Amino acid sequence: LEIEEMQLKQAKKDLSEELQILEAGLFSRIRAVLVAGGVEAEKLDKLPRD
Amino acid sequence: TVSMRDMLKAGVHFGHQTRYWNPKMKPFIFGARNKVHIINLEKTVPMFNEALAELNKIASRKGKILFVGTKRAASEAVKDAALSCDQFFVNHRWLGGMLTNWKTVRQSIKRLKDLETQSQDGTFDKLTKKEALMRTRELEKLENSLGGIKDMGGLPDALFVIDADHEHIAIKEANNLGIPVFAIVDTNSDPDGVDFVIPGNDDAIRAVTLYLGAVAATVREGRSQ
Amino acid sequence: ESFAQLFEESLKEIETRPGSIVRGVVVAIDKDVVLVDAGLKSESAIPAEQFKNAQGELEIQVGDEVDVALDAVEDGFGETLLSREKAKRHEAWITLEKAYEDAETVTGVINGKVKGGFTVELNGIRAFLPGSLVDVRPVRDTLHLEGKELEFKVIKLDQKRNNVVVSRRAVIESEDPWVAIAKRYPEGTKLTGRVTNLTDYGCFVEIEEGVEGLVHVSEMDWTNKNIHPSKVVNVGDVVEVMVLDIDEERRRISLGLKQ
């Protein structure tokens, strides 16, 4: 059961990591596309992870 | 579990003045010293023990306990008790129809949660100063009211109460629902709505604390089991 | 069993009604409310002003023990009458101690007579005495350095109503209220009296051995009508008051405070 917790915490980590990895690419992609519907660079950096 | 001597030390045996009594508490009363009613500790203790046992049992089946005490003297203490055993509580004014009208109050809870999220996880800031202030105020209001019960999800499977006469609305609601009630009931109070009556001094702080602590312990034990 | 019955008569035996047994441990302090627990049904809401000594700041932290008083039970919720009166009994005991050796010695310093007897103050409290008591002879402490140090040698005490006139300097030298209501009478004899209850038209200062005084609302200050006596003086406090009027018939001694 000692290693049980190790793998348990491992799964979640990568699971979120991968999501965050895509999130990083998606966040940039959002701003990338943000030009035909709001390119305001100083008015697009409002909430960070919200 | 809780001894008689300890109770005595605390001031459980003391009650209210004789003119403010309820005659339904005549069984649990022993006598009247200096025109103030004395609760019978011989009859109290076993009952208390039984109540504790019941609580433990409830805990064991993963029961949700709600700790109610809006006296304002023992508001700090009840919250603490709740948190020790990671259970829910209502330390400020009981909202009329908290349990009976859960479905409306569940919306309120949700709103509160949302507000909290906005405050903390968002990290957006940049809000109009008056509006922001208003939001903050709202959050404060919600926290005060429904802070303990925000993670309760549904209705509790038992209801621990520090004063029956003061929290009669809560008790009534419980009765309506069919939730077991575990009330501390001084001589002035009415024991008829209460399932597991505990004859004891609601008013004195030390006594209240004592009452809380044992209950908390029992809950913890149940959880462990 | 009868363990509890015996424990009850035991606990009866190990408490009494007045503020006598120094038992309440101060278990929470917050300005402006002290609170104890002398083995009563509830905790006292103590003022802070029954516990600061002679210059304004507090003296007792957690665990400290003063007795309070009793014989009044439940106004709704709560327990006591204040421990400061407690203190009065101790003062009475020291005053009584005189009788044994015919001389109570402390310090008495009496500058002037509100009502014909220099005022003497012992420790925190200050008392008023009849005019003779301040001086042994015709010496008069007006020529003495102001608020001088002697002791008090007792001249006169009224034994029911509490007025005590005591003897400064000269170390070498060593039904019932209403028939003879002419003692504090004559026009303006100043008194030291504790107020009791302020009835929104009044203040009810009444001390001199089972009487009733009013000081109603008209004087009280140097504003007439907008005053509301609870704002302007106190609750339970010994003040400047004198008679201004006695009816010994419809027992209304009508004191004043604008003096």
Coordinates of C-alpha atoms in Angstrom, one line a residue:
Chain A
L1 CA 0.0 0.0 0.0
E2 CA 3.1 2.3 0.4
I3 CA 3.6 2.4 -3.5
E4 CA -0.3 2.6 -3.9
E5 CA -0.2 6.3 -2.9
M6 CA 2.9 6.9 -5.1
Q7 CA 1.1 5.8 -8.3
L8 CA -2.2 7.4 -7.0
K9 CA -0.5 10.9 -6.9
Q10 CA 1.5 10.1 -10.2
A11 CA -1.7 9.7 -12.4
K12 CA -3.3 13.0 -11.3
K13 CA 0.0 14.9 -11.8
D14 CA 0.5 13.9 -15.4
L15 CA -3.3 14.1 -16.0
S16 CA -3.3 17.8 -15.0
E17 CA 0.1 18.4 -16.5
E18 CA -1.0 17.1 -20.0
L19 CA -4.2 19.3 -19.7
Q20 CA -2.0 22.3 -18.6
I21 CA 0.4 21.5 -21.5
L22 CA -2.6 21.7 -24.0
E23 CA -4.0 24.6 -21.9
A24 CA -0.7 26.5 -22.4
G25 CA -0.9 25.8 -26.2
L26 CA -4.7 26.6 -26.1
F27 CA -4.3 29.9 -24.1
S28 CA -1.7 31.1 -26.6
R29 CA -4.0 29.9 -29.4
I30 CA -6.9 31.8 -27.8
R31 CA -4.8 35.1 -27.9
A32 CA -3.4 34.0 -31.4
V33 CA -7.0 33.9 -32.7
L34 CA -8.0 36.9 -30.5
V35 CA -7.5 39.5 -33.3
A36 CA -10.8 39.3 -35.4
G37 CA -12.8 39.5 -32.1
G38 CA -10.7 41.6 -29.6
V39 CA -6.9 42.0 -30.4
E40 CA -6.6 44.6 -27.5
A41 CA -3.3 43.2 -26.1
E42 CA -3.6 45.4 -23.0
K43 CA -7.3 44.5 -22.6
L44 CA -6.9 40.7 -23.0
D45 CA -4.4 40.1 -20.1
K46 CA -7.2 40.4 -17.4
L47 CA -7.6 37.2 -15.3
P48 CA -4.6 34.8 -15.3
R49 CA -5.9 31.1 -14.5
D50 CA -9.5 32.4 -14.1
Chain B
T1 CA -17.1 8.5 29.1
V2 CA -17.4 12.0 30.6
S3 CA -17.3 11.9 34.4
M4 CA -19.6 13.5 36.9
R5 CA -16.9 15.4 38.8
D6 CA -15.7 17.1 35.7
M7 CA -19.3 18.1 34.8
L8 CA -19.7 19.5 38.3
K9 CA -16.5 21.5 38.0
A10 CA -17.7 22.9 34.6
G11 CA -21.0 24.0 36.1
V12 CA -23.5 21.6 34.3
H13 CA -25.5 21.1 37.5
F14 CA -26.4 24.8 37.6
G15 CA -29.7 25.8 35.9
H16 CA -31.9 28.8 35.4
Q17 CA -33.9 30.7 38.1
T18 CA -37.0 29.0 39.4
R19 CA -39.5 31.4 37.9
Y20 CA -38.2 30.8 34.3
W21 CA -38.4 27.0 34.5
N22 CA -40.4 24.5 32.3
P23 CA -42.4 21.9 34.3
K24 CA -41.6 19.3 31.6
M25 CA -38.0 19.5 33.0
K26 CA -39.2 18.5 36.5
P27 CA -37.9 14.9 36.1
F28 CA -34.4 16.2 35.3
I29 CA -34.3 18.7 38.1
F30 CA -32.9 17.7 41.5
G31 CA -33.6 20.7 43.7
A32 CA -33.4 24.5 44.1
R33 CA -30.4 26.2 45.8
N34 CA -30.6 29.9 46.4
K35 CA -33.8 30.2 44.3
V36 CA -31.9 28.7 41.2
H37 CA -32.7 25.2 39.8
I38 CA -30.2 22.4 40.1
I39 CA -30.1 19.8 37.4
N40 CA -29.8 16.1 38.6
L41 CA -26.4 14.9 37.5
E42 CA -27.4 11.3 38.4
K43 CA -30.1 11.3 35.7
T44 CA -28.1 13.5 33.3
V45 CA -24.9 11.5 32.9
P46 CA -26.3 8.2 31.6
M47 CA -28.5 10.1 29.1
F48 CA -25.5 12.1 28.0
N49 CA -23.5 8.9 27.5
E50 CA -26.3 7.3 25.5
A51 CA -26.4 10.4 23.3
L52 CA -22.7 10.2 22.8
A53 CA -23.0 6.5 21.8
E54 CA -25.7 7.3 19.4
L55 CA -23.6 10.0 17.8
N56 CA -20.7 7.6 17.5
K57 CA -22.9 5.1 15.8
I58 CA -24.2 7.7 13.4
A59 CA -20.6 8.7 12.6
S60 CA -19.7 5.1 11.9
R61 CA -22.2 4.8 9.1
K62 CA -20.7 8.0 7.6
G63 CA -23.4 10.3 9.1
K64 CA -23.4 14.1 8.6
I65 CA -23.6 16.0 11.9
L66 CA -24.7 19.6 12.2
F67 CA -23.6 21.7 15.2
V68 CA -26.0 24.5 16.1
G69 CA -25.2 27.3 18.6
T70 CA -26.2 30.9 18.0
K71 CA -25.8 32.2 21.6
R72 CA -22.8 34.4 20.5
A73 CA -20.9 33.4 23.7
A74 CA -20.2 29.9 22.5
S75 CA -20.2 30.7 18.7
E76 CA -16.4 30.5 18.6
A77 CA -16.3 27.2 20.5
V78 CA -19.0 25.4 18.5
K79 CA -17.2 26.2 15.2
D80 CA -14.0 24.9 16.7
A81 CA -15.7 21.7 17.8
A82 CA -17.1 21.2 14.3
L83 CA -13.8 21.7 12.7
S84 CA -11.9 19.4 15.0
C85 CA -14.0 16.4 13.7
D86 CA -14.4 18.0 10.2
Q87 CA -18.2 18.4 10.5
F88 CA -20.6 21.1 9.6
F89 CA -22.1 23.9 11.8
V90 CA -24.3 26.9 12.2
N91 CA -22.6 29.3 14.7
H92 CA -24.5 32.4 13.6
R93 CA -28.3 32.9 13.3
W94 CA -30.1 29.9 11.9
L95 CA -31.8 30.8 8.6
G96 CA -35.5 30.1 8.9
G97 CA -36.0 27.0 6.8
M98 CA -32.4 26.0 6.3
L99 CA -33.2 22.3 6.2
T100 CA -36.9 22.3 5.3
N101 CA -36.2 24.8 2.5
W102 CA -32.8 23.3 1.5
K103 CA -33.4 23.6 -2.3
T104 CA -33.5 27.4 -2.1
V105 CA -30.6 27.5 0.4
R106 CA -28.6 25.2 -1.8
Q107 CA -28.7 28.0 -4.4
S108 CA -27.4 30.5 -1.8
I109 CA -24.6 28.1 -0.9
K110 CA -23.7 27.7 -4.6
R111 CA -23.6 31.5 -4.9
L112 CA -21.3 31.8 -1.9
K113 CA -19.0 29.2 -3.3
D114 CA -18.8 31.0 -6.6
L115 CA -18.0 34.3 -4.8
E116 CA -15.2 32.5 -2.8
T117 CA -13.8 31.2 -6.1
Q118 CA -13.9 34.6 -7.6
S119 CA -12.1 36.0 -4.6
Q120 CA -9.4 33.4 -4.5
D121 CA -8.7 31.1 -7.5
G122 CA -9.4 33.7 -10.2
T123 CA -6.7 36.3 -9.3
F124 CA -8.3 38.6 -11.8
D125 CA -8.6 41.7 -9.6
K126 CA -9.4 44.9 -11.7
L127 CA -12.9 45.6 -10.5
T128 CA -14.9 48.8 -9.9
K129 CA -14.3 49.9 -6.4
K130 CA -17.9 50.2 -5.2
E131 CA -18.9 47.0 -7.0
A132 CA -15.9 45.2 -5.5
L133 CA -16.7 46.4 -2.0
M134 CA -20.3 45.2 -2.5
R135 CA -19.1 41.8 -3.6
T136 CA -16.8 41.6 -0.6
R137 CA -19.7 42.5 1.7
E138 CA -21.9 39.8 0.1
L139 CA -19.1 37.2 0.6
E140 CA -18.8 38.2 4.2
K141 CA -22.5 37.9 4.8
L142 CA -22.6 34.4 3.1
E143 CA -19.5 33.2 5.1
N144 CA -21.1 34.3 8.4
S145 CA -24.4 32.5 7.6
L146 CA -23.5 29.4 5.7
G147 CA -19.7 28.9 6.2
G148 CA -19.9 25.6 8.1
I149 CA -22.6 24.1 5.9
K150 CA -21.1 24.9 2.5
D151 CA -19.6 21.4 2.1
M152 CA -22.7 19.6 3.5
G153 CA -24.1 18.8 0.1
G154 CA -27.5 17.5 1.2
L155 CA -29.3 17.3 4.6
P156 CA -27.5 16.1 7.8
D157 CA -28.2 12.7 9.3
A158 CA -28.2 14.1 12.9
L159 CA -28.5 17.5 14.6
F160 CA -26.5 18.5 17.7
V161 CA -27.9 21.6 19.5
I162 CA -26.6 23.7 22.4
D163 CA -29.9 25.3 23.4
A164 CA -33.4 23.9 22.6
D165 CA -35.4 27.0 23.5
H166 CA -33.0 29.3 21.5
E167 CA -32.8 27.0 18.4
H168 CA -36.4 25.8 18.4
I169 CA -36.8 26.7 14.8
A170 CA -33.9 24.3 13.9
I171 CA -35.3 21.6 16.2
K172 CA -38.8 22.0 14.6
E173 CA -37.3 21.7 11.1
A174 CA -35.4 18.6 12.2
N175 CA -38.6 17.1 13.5
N176 CA -40.4 17.9 10.3
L177 CA -37.7 16.2 8.3
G178 CA -37.1 13.3 10.7
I179 CA -33.5 14.0 11.6
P180 CA -32.4 12.8 15.1
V181 CA -31.8 15.8 17.5
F182 CA -29.2 15.9 20.2
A183 CA -30.1 19.0 22.3
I184 CA -28.6 20.4 25.5
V185 CA -31.7 21.3 27.4
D186 CA -31.6 23.7 30.4
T187 CA -34.5 23.9 32.9
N188 CA -36.2 26.7 31.0
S189 CA -36.2 24.8 27.7
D190 CA -38.8 22.4 26.2
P191 CA -37.5 18.8 25.7
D192 CA -40.6 17.5 23.7
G193 CA -39.2 18.1 20.2
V194 CA -35.8 16.7 21.2
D195 CA -35.1 13.0 20.6
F196 CA -31.9 12.6 22.7
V197 CA -32.3 15.2 25.5
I198 CA -29.2 16.2 27.5
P199 CA -30.2 18.0 30.8
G200 CA -27.5 20.6 31.2
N201 CA -26.4 24.2 31.5
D202 CA -26.6 25.8 28.0
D203 CA -25.5 29.3 29.3
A204 CA -22.2 28.7 31.1
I205 CA -19.3 28.7 28.6
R206 CA -17.0 26.0 30.2
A207 CA -19.9 23.6 30.4
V208 CA -20.8 24.2 26.8
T209 CA -17.2 23.6 25.8
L210 CA -17.2 20.4 27.7
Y211 CA -20.4 19.3 26.0
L212 CA -18.9 20.1 22.6
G213 CA -15.6 18.4 23.2
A214 CA -16.9 14.9 24.2
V215 CA -19.3 14.9 21.3
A216 CA -16.4 15.8 18.9
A217 CA -14.3 13.0 20.3
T218 CA -17.1 10.5 19.9
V219 CA -17.6 11.7 16.3
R220 CA -13.9 11.3 15.6
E221 CA -14.0 7.8 17.1
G222 CA -17.0 6.8 14.9
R223 CA -15.1 8.1 11.9
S224 CA -12.1 6.1 12.8
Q225 CA -14.2 3.0 13.2
Chain C
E1 CA -26.0 8.2 44.8
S2 CA -26.4 10.0 48.1
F3 CA -22.9 10.9 46.9
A4 CA -24.7 13.6 45.0
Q5 CA -27.0 14.6 47.9
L6 CA -24.0 14.8 50.2
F7 CA -22.1 16.6 47.4
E8 CA -25.0 19.1 47.2
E9 CA -25.0 19.9 50.9
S10 CA -21.2 20.0 50.7
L11 CA -21.3 22.6 48.0
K12 CA -23.9 24.5 50.0
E13 CA -21.4 24.4 52.9
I14 CA -18.6 25.7 50.7
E15 CA -20.3 28.8 49.4
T16 CA -22.3 31.7 50.9
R17 CA -24.6 34.3 49.4
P18 CA -22.7 37.7 49.7
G19 CA -19.5 38.7 48.1
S20 CA -17.5 36.9 50.7
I21 CA -15.6 33.9 49.3
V22 CA -13.1 35.0 46.7
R23 CA -13.9 32.4 44.2
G24 CA -14.5 33.6 40.7
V25 CA -11.5 33.2 38.5
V26 CA -11.2 35.7 35.8
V27 CA -11.6 33.5 32.7
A28 CA -11.9 36.0 29.9
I29 CA -10.8 39.7 29.7
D30 CA -11.9 42.0 26.9
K31 CA -12.3 45.7 27.1
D32 CA -14.7 46.6 28.4
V33 CA -16.0 43.4 30.1
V34 CA -14.4 41.2 32.7
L35 CA -16.0 37.8 33.5
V36 CA -15.6 35.3 36.4
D37 CA -17.1 32.1 37.6
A38 CA -17.7 31.8 41.4
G39 CA -19.5 28.5 41.3
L40 CA -22.8 30.1 40.2
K41 CA -25.4 29.1 37.4
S42 CA -23.8 31.6 34.9
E43 CA -20.7 34.0 34.4
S44 CA -20.8 37.7 35.4
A45 CA -20.7 40.5 32.9
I46 CA -18.3 42.5 35.0
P47 CA -17.5 46.1 34.1
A48 CA -13.9 47.1 33.8
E49 CA -14.6 49.9 36.2
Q50 CA -15.0 47.7 39.3
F51 CA -11.5 46.6 38.5
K52 CA -9.0 49.4 37.9
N53 CA -7.2 50.8 40.9
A54 CA -6.8 54.4 41.7
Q55 CA -5.2 55.6 38.5
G56 CA -7.2 54.0 35.7
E57 CA -5.5 50.8 34.5
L58 CA -6.4 47.2 35.1
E59 CA -4.7 45.1 37.8
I60 CA -5.9 41.5 37.4
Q61 CA -5.1 39.0 34.6
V62 CA -6.5 35.5 34.0
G63 CA -6.9 33.2 37.0
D64 CA -7.3 36.0 39.5
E65 CA -9.9 35.8 42.2
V66 CA -12.2 38.4 43.7
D67 CA -15.6 37.7 45.2
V68 CA -18.5 39.6 43.8
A69 CA -22.0 39.6 45.5
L70 CA -25.4 37.9 45.5
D71 CA -29.0 37.5 46.7
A72 CA -30.3 38.7 43.3
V73 CA -31.0 35.9 40.8
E74 CA -31.7 35.9 37.1
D75 CA -32.8 39.1 35.3
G76 CA -33.3 37.1 32.1
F77 CA -29.8 35.6 31.8
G78 CA -26.7 36.1 33.9
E79 CA -25.4 36.2 37.5
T80 CA -24.3 38.8 39.9
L81 CA -24.2 42.1 41.6
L82 CA -20.7 43.6 41.4
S83 CA -17.6 42.6 43.4
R84 CA -16.6 46.2 44.0
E85 CA -19.3 46.4 46.7
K86 CA -17.5 43.2 48.0
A87 CA -14.6 45.6 48.9
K88 CA -17.0 47.8 51.0
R89 CA -17.3 44.9 53.5
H90 CA -13.5 44.8 53.7
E91 CA -13.5 48.5 54.3
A92 CA -16.2 48.1 57.0
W93 CA -14.1 45.4 58.6
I94 CA -11.1 47.7 58.8
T95 CA -13.3 50.5 60.2
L96 CA -14.7 48.0 62.7
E97 CA -11.1 46.9 63.6
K98 CA -10.8 50.4 65.3
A99 CA -13.3 49.3 68.1
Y100 CA -10.8 46.5 69.3
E101 CA -7.9 49.0 70.2
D102 CA -10.1 52.2 69.9
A103 CA -7.9 53.5 67.0
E104 CA -8.0 52.5 63.2
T105 CA -4.8 53.9 61.6
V106 CA -4.3 54.1 57.8
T107 CA -3.8 57.5 56.0
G108 CA -6.6 60.0 55.8
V109 CA -6.2 63.1 53.7
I110 CA -9.1 65.5 53.8
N111 CA -9.0 68.8 51.9
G112 CA -12.7 70.0 52.1
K113 CA -16.3 69.6 53.2
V114 CA -19.0 69.1 50.6
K115 CA -21.5 68.9 53.4
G116 CA -19.8 70.2 56.6
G117 CA -17.2 67.4 57.1
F118 CA -13.9 67.1 55.3
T119 CA -13.9 64.3 52.7
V120 CA -11.6 61.4 53.5
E121 CA -10.5 58.8 50.9
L122 CA -9.1 55.4 51.9
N123 CA -7.3 53.5 49.2
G124 CA -9.4 53.6 46.0
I125 CA -12.6 54.8 47.7
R126 CA -13.3 58.3 49.0
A127 CA -15.7 58.9 51.8
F128 CA -17.5 62.0 53.2
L129 CA -17.6 62.7 56.9
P130 CA -19.3 65.3 59.1
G131 CA -17.5 68.6 59.6
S132 CA -15.9 68.1 63.0
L133 CA -14.3 64.7 62.1
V134 CA -11.7 66.2 59.8
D135 CA -9.9 68.1 62.5
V136 CA -9.3 67.1 66.2
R137 CA -9.6 70.8 67.3
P138 CA -10.2 74.0 65.3
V139 CA -7.0 73.5 63.3
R140 CA -8.6 73.4 59.9
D141 CA -6.6 71.7 57.0
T142 CA -7.2 74.8 54.7
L143 CA -3.8 76.1 55.9
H144 CA -2.2 72.6 55.7
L145 CA -0.4 71.7 52.5
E146 CA -3.2 70.6 50.0
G147 CA -4.4 67.1 50.2
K148 CA -2.0 66.4 53.1
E149 CA -0.9 63.1 54.7
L150 CA -2.1 62.1 58.2
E151 CA -4.3 59.0 58.7
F152 CA -8.0 59.4 59.8
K153 CA -9.0 59.3 63.5
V154 CA -12.7 58.7 63.6
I155 CA -14.9 61.6 64.8
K156 CA -18.4 60.5 63.8
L157 CA -20.1 57.8 61.8
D158 CA -23.9 57.4 61.2
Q159 CA -24.0 53.6 61.5
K160 CA -26.9 52.9 59.1
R161 CA -26.5 55.5 56.3
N162 CA -22.8 55.4 55.6
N163 CA -21.2 58.7 56.4
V164 CA -17.8 58.6 58.3
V165 CA -16.0 61.8 59.3
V166 CA -12.3 61.1 60.2
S167 CA -9.4 63.1 62.2
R168 CA -6.5 64.5 60.1
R169 CA -3.1 65.5 61.6
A170 CA -2.5 65.7 65.3
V171 CA -0.8 62.3 65.7
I172 CA -0.4 63.0 69.5
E173 CA -4.2 63.1 70.1
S174 CA -5.6 59.7 71.1
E175 CA -40.2 54.7 60.7
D176 CA -36.4 54.8 60.9
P177 CA -35.2 57.4 58.2
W178 CA -38.3 59.6 58.4
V179 CA -38.9 60.8 62.0
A180 CA -35.6 62.7 62.4
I181 CA -35.1 63.7 58.8
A182 CA -33.3 66.9 59.7
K183 CA -29.7 65.8 59.6
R184 CA -28.8 66.4 55.9
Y185 CA -31.6 68.9 55.7
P186 CA -30.8 72.5 56.1
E187 CA -30.6 73.9 52.6
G188 CA -27.8 72.4 50.6
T189 CA -25.9 69.7 52.5
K190 CA -23.7 67.9 49.9
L191 CA -23.7 64.1 49.9
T192 CA -21.8 61.2 48.3
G193 CA -24.4 58.8 46.9
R194 CA -24.4 55.8 44.5
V195 CA -26.9 56.0 41.7
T196 CA -29.2 53.0 41.3
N197 CA -31.4 53.2 38.2
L198 CA -32.0 56.0 35.7
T199 CA -35.6 56.0 34.7
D200 CA -35.2 58.3 31.6
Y201 CA -36.6 61.2 33.7
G202 CA -34.3 60.6 36.6
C203 CA -31.2 59.0 38.0
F204 CA -32.2 57.8 41.5
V205 CA -29.1 58.4 43.7
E206 CA -30.1 57.2 47.2
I207 CA -27.6 56.3 49.8
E208 CA -28.3 57.7 53.3
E209 CA -29.8 54.7 55.1
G210 CA -33.0 53.7 53.3
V211 CA -34.2 56.9 51.5
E212 CA -34.9 57.9 47.9
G213 CA -33.4 60.8 45.9
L214 CA -34.0 61.8 42.3
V215 CA -31.9 64.5 40.6
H216 CA -34.5 64.0 37.8
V217 CA -33.2 65.6 34.5
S218 CA -33.5 69.4 34.8
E219 CA -30.3 70.0 36.7
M220 CA -27.8 67.1 36.1
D221 CA -25.6 69.2 33.8
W222 CA -25.8 72.7 32.4
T223 CA -28.2 71.7 29.5
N224 CA -31.8 71.3 30.2
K225 CA -33.8 69.0 28.0
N226 CA -31.7 67.2 25.4
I227 CA -29.6 65.5 28.0
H228 CA -30.8 61.9 28.6
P229 CA -29.2 61.1 32.0
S230 CA -27.8 57.7 30.9
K231 CA -25.4 59.6 28.5
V232 CA -24.3 62.2 31.0
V233 CA -23.4 60.5 34.3
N234 CA -23.2 56.7 34.8
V235 CA -24.8 53.6 36.1
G236 CA -23.9 52.6 39.8
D237 CA -21.6 55.4 40.8
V238 CA -21.0 57.6 43.8
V239 CA -21.5 61.3 43.0
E240 CA -21.6 64.9 44.1
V241 CA -25.2 65.2 45.3
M242 CA -27.0 67.3 48.0
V243 CA -30.6 67.7 49.1
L244 CA -32.0 71.0 47.8
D245 CA -35.4 69.9 49.2
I246 CA -36.9 67.4 51.8
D247 CA -40.5 66.5 52.3
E248 CA -40.4 64.2 55.4
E249 CA -44.1 63.5 54.8
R250 CA -44.4 62.3 51.0
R251 CA -40.8 60.9 51.3
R252 CA -39.6 62.8 48.3
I253 CA -36.1 64.2 49.0
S254 CA -35.4 66.0 45.7
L255 CA -31.7 66.2 45.3
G256 CA -29.7 68.0 42.7
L257 CA -26.4 67.7 40.7
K258 CA -26.0 71.0 38.9
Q259 CA -24.3 72.3 42.0

